[PDB]
Amino acid sequence: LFPPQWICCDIRYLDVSILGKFAVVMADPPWDIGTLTDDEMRRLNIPVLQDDGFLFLWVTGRAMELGRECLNLWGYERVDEIIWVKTNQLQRIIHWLNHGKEHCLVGVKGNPQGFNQGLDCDVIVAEVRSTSHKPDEIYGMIERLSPGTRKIELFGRPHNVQPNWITLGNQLDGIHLLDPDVVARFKQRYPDGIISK
Amino acid sequence: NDYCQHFVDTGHRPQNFIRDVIRLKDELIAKSNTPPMYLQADIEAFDIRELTPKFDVILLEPPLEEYYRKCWTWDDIMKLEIDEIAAPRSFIFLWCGSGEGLDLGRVCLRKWGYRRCEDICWIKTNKNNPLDPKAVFQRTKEHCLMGIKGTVDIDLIITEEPEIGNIEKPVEIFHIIEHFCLGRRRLHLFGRDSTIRPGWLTVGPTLTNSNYNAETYASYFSAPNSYLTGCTEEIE
């Protein structure tokens, strides 16, 4: 379990029922603002991934509205909104206005218990790395919120892989699965080891 | 340097460590500003239609229950007929707090006929001072959503957490609006005596004096001043 696991794949086509239930889902989707259409986004099978937990959903532009929509369709209530203030290595800030921040919606589903609500604040301050590259502070925040629990990231890239996290994304390097029950349900669902349509 | 870890350790919000917080344009705005006008009105009980003309900019600062730790619920706000006093091409700036208003205020914008184009965040430092039940994190910001209908600055305002019970929003919001140069008929709903400001009509229940006259107000925008940006010369 504990060490980073991942799956290179098209998240549209993967049968995420094999992966089980997670205390936290994080998604950083390629909103159409290799992107996904709004219907493709609305159709993702997020609802099977959780019973009681949180969803972290990166948004920008009109995805700010659309992400709220997917968030509610998938069965979550938006209860927080993190913003990451973008700085350089000297802690200064990098249509109508220039943008100094990225938004991440926080959704709750069910009734999660045993989480440490209230340890971090809803503002992150941290340096920009690659274009499209998220700050590692979010993993620290998510760890303090729900420590030791299983977490899944959608549309992550290789640098995003983390302990306790299963990463899905089409630019990862193949498949790397260590959780036995997940290896089991994977082999049952994908015996010849391919995932299309 | 993990500023979130640091905040968990010390009580210092990450924004505490952001460093570092054109003139002639301010002069041009200040020159073309109408005299401040203001009217005491109980907005729930007041037909907003007798505020004329239609406005180019609306700054809407309803008193949210969450600001206190007469309040207006989003139920009340959503029933305001904002679309009846907005110019066909106009802009709205709506303070939504940090809770459900982030969603309900977006409903309002669409209800009144606007689409969101900016999400301006007021980030509140606690350098001088190291919970909603639904909350997952400590809330250290408020959002002011910007709307457009029809056809320099950044989207962050950083200041210290005001004293408890102080509901004032940072005056920087006004600079941001005015630097957009969106027109001269500017309305601030639920302003206060403390927010009255040249270039602005203020309507709100706690104002102590009124000077508003609909004809005097319309005076300021008659030809040849009908379509000014507020960022240009006075027409001699």
Ligand SMILES: CC1(C)CCN(Cc2ccc3[nH]c(C[C@]4(O)CCCN(c5cc(NCc6ccccc6)ncn5)C4)nc3c2)CC1
């Ligand atoms: C914190 C932020 C600043 C981080 C950046 N954020 C915006 C952003 C920017 C760049 C990103 N780069 C990826 C990783 C991905 O791999 C890139 C490539 C397609 N990705 C898919 C797509 C997919 N299905 C459809 C498909 C498949 C093949 C060919 C075409 C279409 N299946 C699995 N991965 C996803 N996420 C990103 C998010 C803002 C906040």
